[model samples]
Target: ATPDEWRSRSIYQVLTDRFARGDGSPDAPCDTGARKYCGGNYRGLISQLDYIQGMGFDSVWISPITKQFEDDWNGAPYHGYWQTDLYALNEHFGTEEDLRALADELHARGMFLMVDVVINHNGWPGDAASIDYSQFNPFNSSDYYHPPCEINYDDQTSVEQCWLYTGANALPDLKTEDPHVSQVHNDWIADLVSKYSIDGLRIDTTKHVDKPAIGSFNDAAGVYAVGEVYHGDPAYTCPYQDWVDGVLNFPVYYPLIDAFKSPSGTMWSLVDNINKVFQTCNDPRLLGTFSENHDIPRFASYTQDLALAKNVLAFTILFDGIPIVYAGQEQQYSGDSDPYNREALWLSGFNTDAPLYKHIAACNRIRSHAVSNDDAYITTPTDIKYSDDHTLALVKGAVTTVLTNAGANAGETTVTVEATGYASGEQVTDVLSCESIAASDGGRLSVTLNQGLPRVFFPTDALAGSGLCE
Candidate 1:
């Protein structure tokens, strides 16, 4: 079976409609900015299991599989955050059988399925002021939602009680604080998880809902829950760890972006962020470590340079916690913002030969192999060994990952580390270049950076028959 503990898993995030179509045909005139459905379904996703597993992800994080608002408020909810009915599956994706097939196939391969869910709000039939709440299901009445009020970014009370938008496209905030409302939410999640065999959950807009309700809802689901607490400060994001199994690691993401976008990026900011998060979060290693997602701009958006992007990719996957690679990210998609960032993966033909694709595969292999040989690979905390303006090195368990922001045109620079994961004179392998590496005197490592890329060192003998660098 796929591991139950999320920390050991590497996730491949998919935007269902943009990944592939059910008919085995490319989406015609699929303008990502149009924000329309592209015919991709659970059947199409099932067909691409090999492609996803080949990338070495043990789990897949898919868009919300529940029914959503069909009304085209400017653009449809093809991305699946805007939910309406809580009991029905989105027929646009597939029928219940197709979804079951997806779960079965993933479980058969020992890969987990993580479904994204929205418990914070529901789409309304009319404007916020005159919302026809009767159109909603289960809690189909104005009593289920808070009074119409726009959110005040400065006020937590307003944020919890207000509509995300004011007009026709408003999101009616659910009154999760009410006892009946909370009970229904928990009961619905319980049935959803059991009926579909969901292995994990990615709770959307997690901070907007009542904290106690979120905690009970996750407990009912009985799976690992990673809430999307989209805040940049440790103080704000860390508290959610008490309510959910993990968060999307947004606190670390900002500094990670600041540290690896280019050679000019600050390595110190990322190092500082990681340390603060460790001290603040319940278990920092439980957070999702990533650089791109459905909401954020692509890593290539800031730095299209291949080497710089590769550095970020390696750092994200080889760092700590659950690693999530959004669709089209490996193809180096350079969409700069939302709608744009959610590009169709089929447009890239799912080419496995892409440089970033191979880099991700390499990173997954080393990480998975380390985990297989020693449980500590996932349980042990990652610590920084060295960090400068352009370079950052960290050690975790049996692997030492070295990364640099220097782009493709950079000259070689020596990285010496007194802290190492291996013993003195023990042989290691530079998995990227497939070269044999040996620790110098006193269990120290000094490797020269080449091709302006990242390097992961592991015990050479442990890789025997692993097919890595063989």
Candidate 2:
């Protein structure tokens, strides 16, 4: 099977900086005895295998494990983004054996591993007192990078080849267009997969590199590569997929976050975007659908209602394409961007009792079996069943349908179910909340949805004789 062949699966994304402390220390620039690290290791992750599997996640996307340059330039290496050695794994995280063990445990459970890779730039430079870029060897100097150039806000080439930052902390860009760089990148990927057998590569800052060359690298890796394009619209995000398998699906992320934050947000704003994505992209399945990630602020922090959080989580898991949730998201961690957004998850008590976590777990469970080794079962919106100011309804399967309320206020919405083979007075149940509704004449279902909640129904035939009595 292809890397993304399992499109219906839900993925869990972990940022190593805040995930768990392998060494039991909270030190960032250097090690000091602090319990904030919480000692989360690959073995630690391995130990929690059952916990993750129980959550219904079929894949895990981990932060970069590369060896970070020691001795502070700006701050501590806790973030894991600043790398000194491309070949070495950070000791603070764990040993190679630990990484292998984590991958092995995941493979045993039929779960995928999507690794985050930083190839666009290198680590931070130092001030006058601590100046030593030579240790970075090979592509060490400014000559190796696009000399002090900033990305042109509108132009493509500038965005692809320009140096990202200006001074000491500036990350010197890698020239992937060069044959040697391309070869080295491919070799690194081939070794990683052969070593731990990772399932996919989540290419970070891919927009900063040459576009066509990215596809070349993906082709060379011979595995699925999902790039983070970071653009706001289809015009900017879709083309990056030409070289890569797909992008992080930022086209959906913006509206998704907004829909949950504002009660007046429209459901059409979201589904319409998905329609455009499918119509524009070569393979919509490659897109990684998510609401919150490391770079963005936490969704729960922005929304006042915990119910809104659960609603968004449900939509992400059942929506078309692959779904991803950040590590602390289930705990209702509220953070707004880096530093704050990257807080240690182990510190949060690993709250599995959170309602959003259970909701996502249920959604993933239903999706895994419903799609059932058949990609065709996951459907994008073909036609709108009902679209008003607040509610939007979409048919995922012949019997399965999802209704989302995007507006700020709760209200009643009617959707026709005649085409779905339901007659008046027939009953349907929402498996998530265990709430039942009576079908009306002309196959119409009238539902009162609170703002931001989604009511999903499976046809009676689909769950026939499953003992669904109410």
Candidate 3:
């Protein structure tokens, strides 16, 4: 499938450490942290394919599998973000054959595979004496990384090149802009695709590399690379598309979190933020939409209410971009940071009955069908009926009229939808719930919604309206 195919697909991001750890022995286990590697291997993930496939995700974005520093860092090598060895697969996760098998299995099921990669820096201390730096290919020594330079907050160069997360885990920044180094990086990634048939890549710390270097690498690799520019606004994150296929949709993420946290906030704020993303992004479909990831705390940790979490899931799935549901989100895993959020996914119970799980699964199923076949086509309403700050109603074609409540609270809403092309006073069925609603004079319609729920009206010609009874 083409990269565009991936755009419409809902992605499920699985952090290996937290994902199931199979019965197989770990390749290498050190004191990275208790949260680091508790046995989440590729084989474990492969075994759970049926579980993920049943959930209706078209693509899976997983954390980096590259060999990392084995030393017991803070709490875990579990998340797999820290890079120590670029060439070898983190034996802790699994063997190269195991990873390739996982990719092959996903492809067999027609699911796209997106692997996370870190080109920015190596893990903690390269010359820690205890760890084998020689086992690390090019970055075996300190010379491989940028000189110890703290990013000057005011200067853009410092912000772009300086070491981030300095003291806690000092990551030596790579001089990616250098022509020689850039070629090595590109070649290494190309090898990854050629070797394993990776469909897509998630470039970690994309903003740290220069635009030319990033673009050149992507061009060399000749595949979809979703760069991670974790800034909170479109102006900061979206522009990185100049280098790669797309960047993480942080503009939507920040506002989404805010809207969920405080529904009292302006509804216009969420709408405006989404509008900005579509307009600013080079390709809106390519952008990855997410609320919480490995770095951030769980959304549930901040809010006790599950209703708001459902709303967040609805917004992410129904919106225009590619939505990504991170691991543990479905289980309502509410851990804070490292040891907390990065715990085993099985620990969350993996109950299919969980509200968060069902909510996410429902949205993913809807999105999978909505964006399935069509490639490039302008969507215009057959009838421009009613809209306001709280609700909106529009007919997709002659068949579908979707009504959505922008508010988090349920309320009775009204809309004036003209009969334009349909017979007046015709009875229509709500395809979603299979409930029937009669069309009013001049095609005006009224409906009540319970917070962020959408009511889809289907023309009578499409169905016998018998299914509307449900």
Candidate 4:
């Protein structure tokens, strides 16, 4: 737990073969038009790490544990991205003492793992002349690849020197500015982060590599990293947090899927795309706040409006950064793209009384009680006290949220939260409707909400009644 303690942890992610099946039988009926394998492993994510730390996720991520490539172009490799073999491992997601006992059961449940690595391409079961870098282990030198050319994704040097896919399922692009392929991907990610005690890394396709070879493979995996720069333009994904430690905010995930599901959506265009990633990241608390991942689509397939999917899962865990979620997004699974947005968390029976799983476990227990009562509440400083065209009101440290999509028949509006660190009469509460409020004078608070719900509040003597503000 150090990527600056993973910016106040939240993660979750998961897709290890559609999350859950290790002998707990029941979810083995694949071929949803051949997206392949449905028998999840790593002992079905260590039998659902207490259904993901009972929803108040501390961290997880998963997915690529190397070895892949059976079929490609659109099937098999079960989702562990097609990396043919980075020193083996993915015997269909198990063994290596089942991923070192899933990282010793996430450090004995104090949680934190992250995984997913694939250093810019290795698997291609089809073209580039039916590749096989002599079963690539120690990057079987074809001079560590990069000659086949393809990816001109609007050329940033042909998206950092080509080769991403072409024919059956090409990927083969490495040669990360060859220093023997950057010291064999920095000694294979410092021996896969000390042979799996791994605390962080999500790397894969990091803007098609080469920003000092992605800061020399994130300072040779000495932990805490986050790359995948799949642009949304915070000046093209905030200069890869100077090469690592953050980026998957997809520049505010396209105005948070157009202010919570378009129709000219506008809560001041998600508060001007969160003040344009807090004036273009460099450390928007090391970015990574998500609104549905597994390469897009599901945010209940763009709003099935369970009150705008519980107001975008309570502004993705009281916004700023670091909140993740993903796997079937708390069972509101609206499968759309990629393998129908990767569904199957054992058909949602892991329901910890789901409703965005108790509203993301009461927004991660009010953001782990404001980052354990202010260690600067995990880099606080939000304060957009109020926006319009369908509410927004902000403030972060002492909580205050408020959002709204305004459509449960759009009626109640009356916002008015100004300074809100709470003072005047000080009662505040709404821990998602334990409804309280009181403050008036300068530390304002005139809520009303209802149309499309979302109201967080806080400060009832700093959550004194504590049953989440009784």
Candidate 5:
């Protein structure tokens, strides 16, 4: 599947070294320590494809497989970001054959593969002056890299031109503006795509590269691409879609965290942000919607309320963009930040019966059914039926979603909103709860949202006897 096809599918992001061991032994002990290698590899990931597919995800996003420095100033490159040899596959993750098998297995299952790639800089081994350019692949010349200088993110020019990191471990920034550098990267990426049969790319550090260079790099990849802009403002993250196919949607991620986790969180905050994204983005559906990733703390770390986590999961899967669930999120693994956030999935025993796991599977099943029932579900217009401090309601095609962030102490609150997609006196069911309701005379429905839980309703005619509804 290409990236366009991925819009209708949910994605599971896996950190290669932390997902599973290569031998298919679920009982195999794994190191949960944040920084060291935990033995996950391409073979391990291939072994557990059923685990991901079982959660109803049709696509997988894995960390970069290119050769990386064994150890850096920060620690092991097991997370796969520190690139040294672009052409060689990292032996730690397994051989080229293992990766090919992984891709082949996903394709055979009708699933897609999205590989993360870095273009802005090379691994931070030591000081810039101490590095040997002779060992660099394709970009071995000194002219290919900019002089080492710390990036000042406040200044756009400095951000695009300067090296990332500081002191002795600064990453060597590529001078992507150099036409020769662009040619080499373009050729390298094209070959990478064809060689691996890659369906898509998750571009790392997109904001640090020149816009023109980012555009050329994406075009050369010849597949669906989404870049990491790492900004909370829609204005900052939305324009990249013009250069690539889409961006990570950091604009909405911040609001989502605030709405669901913060003490001061209000549902209206998320509602407003979604309104802004719909108005500003060139293609809102193409954006990648995620709650937690390798760079941030897990959602469970903020609020252990499983109800809140389940609500967030439902919203992400049913929202405007492509939903991305980090590997350990299903098990409610609450590791805080970076290496901690990247916990080994094996530790959870790959439990299919986990609460959040089942919730996610249900959401994916409903989303698939909704989209398959009507092609419009993929890009349907969304209308906010109601929005307030404690609750928010919206409708997309025949699906109506109601969310509440009030804690258990707040009790249930009933709210009535116009059901845009249903006809008068028609029956509807909240698939999440299996509760049914009848549309009123004017096509209005009143839903009582329990504290901290969400309700997703679909027309009975569309979902009839699917076991999701009463």
Candidate 6:
């Protein structure tokens, strides 16, 4: 399939263990801090596709599907990252049949499936240096893994060669460069994709693996792959597009967090990153952009201000690349990093009426309308319209989005955009608020952030029957 097939899709990420239990389990008390399984399975996911689809997500990216170490004292494998068997399914989440059914269900709804995969290492519950090599499946030989040693994050080669953990539980870094390892992984992944009709892949710990090895693995699957580089620098994170289809867009994530968490946050710094990633990445249009995920602290943990969350969410859903929102983000779950960030979504009862949920739907609906009215919307380069200490304005496709770091109490502020590319005297409406504005002199338009809310303006003519502020 052509990699561009995903540019027009918006993905919703589901952590199977914590999302919902397949057997119709109600909102039970779940302390994600415990990091134990909350019983979310493939059936649980199938039961809640409406919740995801209602929010306008066209694809679901679940956690890894591989089997984990049976009994680990180091920690529970609720997160699905610790892979013990590549061929076996993680029955704790669901059986292989359950997974295939889930994939089929998604396709029946005209949605796509993107399953996570782990190939960089096999999880060792004990000290990796002293672990028994015989326990690993398929690759029981010591030659499959690199000898134990802590990785030096500063050195790229050390980062590639050494283990990620040296204490309690360790990840035995696989010798991905070895011909045997690459061939086996490719064989396993290709079969897995074909068997389940997996439309795409969310490759785990990708930067830790041998760089060129991933290309062969991806080629084997014959599908689009977005690797997790997990770094903040565009210099390190951008080049992976050559090896795979795209990346998680971490280069833009850090700046987005800093600029949207509080009032008067650094919009100029975020602007720099936006420009840098587009210039550096092979094709920034295909990268996945987001503000919250399983690995990091939640956006609300920094500041629960609803307006700030809206500003951040607006950029995430409206910006370039594929917009991927984690399961609890629409509910505004404020759980902090790691275990905390992966909250049980059932607690909120999957309320579609929640403020942020409706906000997300509105954003997605507008984007869908924009793309429907103009086919080139998904790949068209976004142009900067305005920016200041508190605000940033950008026009992508047929919509002009205005966002601000000014907190919920900023009262009212106006910024005159010097150029919007629309003709002077053209009338545009902010779909979020349905306010009409006439482009003034030289296509210059003034935008107001009432209560510091995010604004997205579209040409009124394009929104004829969109069911959004018609």
State which candidate has the highest lDDT. Answer: 6
TM-score versus the correct structure, for each prediction: 0.97, 0.88, 0.84, 0.36, 0.96, 0.98
Report the lDDT of model 3 for residue 226. 86
lDDT of 4: 0.80
The superposed Cα distance between candidate 6 and the true structure at residue 47, in angstroms, equals 0.6
What would the per-residue lDDT of candidate 1 be over residues 1-470, giving only the tens digit for each residue? Answer: 22247778999999988888767765455788787887788999999888898989989999998888887857888888777889998888999999999999999999999999998888754578777778788879889888888889999888788888768777889898999999998999889888989999999998898789889988988889999998999989999999998998998899888877777777887888899999999887778888999788898999878888888888889888899999998999989998899888887887999988888999998899888899667878898988888888889988988998887888889989876857888999989899887998776899889878888899999997666998
Candidate 2 lDDT over 1-470, as tens digits, reads: 26546566578888765665544443433122231233456765666566577778988888788887776636666656767777889877788988888888888898888888888877765532243557664555544555557778788788878766656566667787888777777788777777878788889899888876687777766778889999868777887777888788898788777666766676666766777787777777768888889888898778757667777777677666788888878888887766577666666556677777677777776667566533567654334566665555555653344555454355444444444435777776766766877677776777666554677665544554433323
Candidate 4 residue lDDT tens string, 1-470: 46788888889888888888778765466554578778788888888888888778988888988887765555677887777678878788888998898889888988888988877787767877778787777777667887787886778877877787766677778778888878888888888899888998888788888888788888888888888788887777786788788878876777767887843587775677678778877778777788888777887777677778888878887887788889888889887788788877887778788778888888888888788777987887677888877677778778888887775666666877777868889887888878786988989889998767888888777776355755
Error of 1 at 84 (Å): 1.4
lDDT tens readout by residue for model 3, 344-437: 6665545667877766665565444443322342132123345455444444334443434344454454455555344567777655466777
lDDT by candidate, in order shown? 0.86, 0.70, 0.68, 0.80, 0.84, 0.87
| Candidate 5 Cα outliers beyond 4 Å, as residue runs | 1-3, 27-34, 72-74, 464-470
Q: Per-residue alpha-carbon lDDT of model 5 for 1-470, expressed as tens digits?
A: 35568678778999988888888666655555646677889999988999998888998999998888765455778878878889998888999899999999999999889999999988766777777777677677767898888878789989998888645555888998899889989999999999999988899999999999999999999888989888988777787788988898888888788888843588766877788888888888888989989999999999888778877888888887788999999999998876678878998889999998888887888888888898888888667888888677778888887877775445668988874557888998888778888888677988887766788888877895454754
Candidates sorted by lDDT, descending order? 6, 1, 5, 4, 2, 3
Clashing pairs in 4: none
TM-score for model 2? 0.88
Whole-structure CA lDDT of model 6: 0.87
Give the runs in model 1 whose Cα sits over 4 Å from its true position: 1-4
Worst 10 residues of 3 by lDDT: 373-382
Worst 10 residues of 6 by lDDT: 70-79
The residue pairs that clash in candidate 1, if any, are none
Cα lDDT tens digits for candidate 6, 1-470 = 35778888899998998888876766777887777788888998999999898988999999899888877565688788888788898998888889989999999999999989988888777786677778888778888988888888888878888988877577888898899999999999899998999999999988998778989998998999999998998999999988989999998999899999988578887899889998899899889988989888998899989999999989999998899998999998998888888889988898889999999998999998888898888889988888888889988866889999888888999899877877898899988888889888887889888888999988887789788895
Residue 363 lDDT (model 1): 92
